[PDB]
Design a protein around this ligand. Structure first.
Ligand SMILES: [Cl-]
Ligand SMILES: [Cl-]
Ligand SMILES: [Cl-]
Ligand SMILES: [Cl-]
Ligand SMILES: [Cl-]
Ligand SMILES: [Cl-]
Ligand SMILES: [Cl-]
Ligand code: NA
Length: 129
């Protein structure tokens, strides 16, 4: 599924991400824009052989099981394929665990490089939330 900007903002709010660990909804929408372009089916292989899955590009190295990432963990206790669903529940639940892990949204390198410190409220501007 390819979400619209306000459509995803609304879904993220419905699943309790807005202001989760103090990160306003525009931070989460900005992260999703640069990680996946709002596409739930986005996948990207990392040089180390791990893979990033879904709207928030969650990595098989730590967070999900894809059966092909040696020495990895599955801390969200999910198959990485669950992160590609049109329903964002599994991605949101796993993202809440990641952002609680100690470095907040810095875990998302695209958030640190493209969203951090910017006018992230622009991402929810005009949205009926
Ligand atoms: Cl957009
Ligand atoms: Cl915001
Ligand atoms: Cl594995
Ligand atoms: Cl594990
Ligand atoms: Cl599995
Ligand atoms: Cl959803
Ligand atoms: Cl933080
Ligand atoms: Na894994």
């Amino acid at each position: 599924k390819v979400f619209g900007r306000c459509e995803l903002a609304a879904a993220m709010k419905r699943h309790g991400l807005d202001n989760y660990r103090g990160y306003s909804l525009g931070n989460w929408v900005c992260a999703a824009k640069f990680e996946s372009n709002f596409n739930t089916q986005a996948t990207n292989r990392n040089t180390d052989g791990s893979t990033d899955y879904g709207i928030l590009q969650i990595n098989s190295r730590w967070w999900c099981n894809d059966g092909r990432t040696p020495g990895s963990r599955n801390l969200c206790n999910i198959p990485c394929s669950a992160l590609l669903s049109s329903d964002i529940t599994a991605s949101v639940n796993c993202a809440k665990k990641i952002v609680s892990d100690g470095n907040g949204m810095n875990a998302w390198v695209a958030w640190r490089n493209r969203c951090k410190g910017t006018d992230v409220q622009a991402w929810i501007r005009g949205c009926r939330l």
